[PDB]
Design a protein around this ligand. Structure first.
Ligand SMILES: O=C1COc2ccc(/C(Cc3ccccc3)=N/n3cnnc3S)cc2N1
Ligand SMILES: O=C1COc2ccc(C3=Nn4cnnc4S[C@H]3c3ccccc3)cc2N1
Ligand SMILES: [K+]
Length: 255
C-alpha cells in the first residue's frame, strides 16, 4: 500500500527522490541454449531495450519537474534520449557490478570480448566500454549518476525547439543546479566540468549507436534482427528526424 503520509513528512530532496524512483532490475531473457549469433544477440538486446524503455517511461513520470512538460514534449524527450539513457545505464551497471570489466546488460546477459564480437557490435561495444572506464577513472557516485541520467533525458531536442521550451529549460537548469550542488557537497568546478564533459561525450557515442541501430533496423529482415513494438515506434519516427538534421544535441562545452 501507499505510505505517502510518512514519505511526504520525510520531505525527500530531489536527489533522494531520484534514488527512490530508480528502475528495478530488468532481465534480458537471454537463452544460453541458443546460438550466440548476431541475430540472436541483437534480438535479445532489443528485447531488453524495449523492456527497459517501459521502465524509463514509468521513471520519467515520477521524475520531479517532468509533469510540468506537455505530453508532446514528454514523448519527444523520452524518444530522443532513449539510446543515451540506456547506454548510460549500461555503463553504470558495468561499473557497479563488474568494475567496468564487462558490459553488464542484465544479470543474465553480461558481455565479454567474445560476446562483443558475436553481437556484430564489437567496435561500438568498445566505445561503450570507454564510458564505463571513465566511470572508474572518475569514481562516479550513484548520486552523480542519477542526476546525470536526468540531464541525458534532457539532452536532445528538436532543432526548432520543444512545444514548451521555457518549461524544458527550467527543468534542465534545475537539474544542472542539482549537479552543481552535488559536486560541491577544492575541485568543485573541475568535477562539474569532468561530469558535464562526459555528458557531452555521450552524444558522440550515441549518434554512432543510433546510426548503427537505424542501419540494422532498415536491414532487419535480411539480418534477422527483431525489434519490439516500442522500439519500432521510436526508431521509425526518429529516423527521418535525425537524418534530416532536425535533432539537436545540447552540449555544456560545445556550441
Ligand atoms: O561495431 C561495429 C562497427 O561498425 C560495423 C559496421 C558494419 C557492421 C555489420 C555487421 C552487422 C551484422 C548484423 C547486424 C548489424 C550489423 N555490417 N554488416 C552488414 N551486413 N552484414 C554485416 S556483418 C557491424 C559493425 N559493428
Ligand atoms: O539492433 C540493434 C543494433 O543497434 C543497436 C545499438 C544499441 C543498442 C543498445 N541496446 N541496449 C540494450 N540494453 N541497453 C542497451 S543500450 C545499446 C547498446 C549500447 C552499447 C553497446 C550495445 C548496445 C541496441 C541496438 N540494436
Ligand atoms: K552549448
Amino acid at each position: 500500500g501507499s505510505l505517502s503520509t510518512i514519505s511526504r513528512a520525510l520531505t525527500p530532496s530531489p536527489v533522494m527522490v531520484l534514488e527512490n524512483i530508480e528502475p528495478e532490475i530488468v532481465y534480458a531473457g537471454y537463452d544460453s541454449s541458443k546460438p550466440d549469433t548476431a541475430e540472436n544477440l541483437l534480438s535479445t538486446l532489443n528485447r531488453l531495450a524495449g523492456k527497459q524503455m517501459i521502465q524509463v517511461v514509468k521513471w520519467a513520470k515520477v521524475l520531479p519537474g517532468f509533469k510540468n512538460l506537455p505530453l508532446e514534449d514528454q514523448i519527444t524527450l523520452i524518444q530522443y534520449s532513449w539510446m543515451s539513457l540506456l547506454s548510460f545505464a549500461l555503463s553504470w551497471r558495468s561499473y557497479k557490478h563488474t568494475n567496468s570489466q564487462f558490459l553488464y546488460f542484465a544479470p543474465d546477459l553480461v558481455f565479454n570480448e567474445e560476446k562483443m564480437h558475436q553481437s556484430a557490435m564489437y567496435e561500438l561495444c568498445q566505445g561503450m566500454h570507454q564510458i564505463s572506464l571513465q566511470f572508474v577513472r572518475l569514481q562516479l557516485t550513484f548520486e552523480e549518476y542519477t542526476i546525470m541520467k536526468v540531464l541525458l533525458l534532457l539532452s536532445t531536442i528538436p532543432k526548432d525547439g520543444l512545444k514548451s521550451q521555457a518549461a524544458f529549460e527550467e527543468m534542465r537548469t534545475n537539474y544542472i543546479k542539482e549537479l552543481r550542488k552535488m559536486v560541491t557537497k577544492g575541485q568543485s568546478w573541475q568535477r562539474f566540468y569532468q561530469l558535464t564533459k562526459l555528458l557531452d561525450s555521450m552524444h558522440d557515442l550515441v549518434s554512432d549507436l543510433l546510426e548503427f541501430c537505424f542501419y540494422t533496423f532498415r536491414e532487419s529482415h535480411a539480418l534477422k534482427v527483431e525489434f519490439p513494438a516500442m522500439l519500432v515506434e521510436i526508431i521509425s519516427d526518429q529516423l527521418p528526424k535525425v537524418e534530416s538534421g532536425n535533432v539537436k544535441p545540447l552540449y555544456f562545452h560545445r556550441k
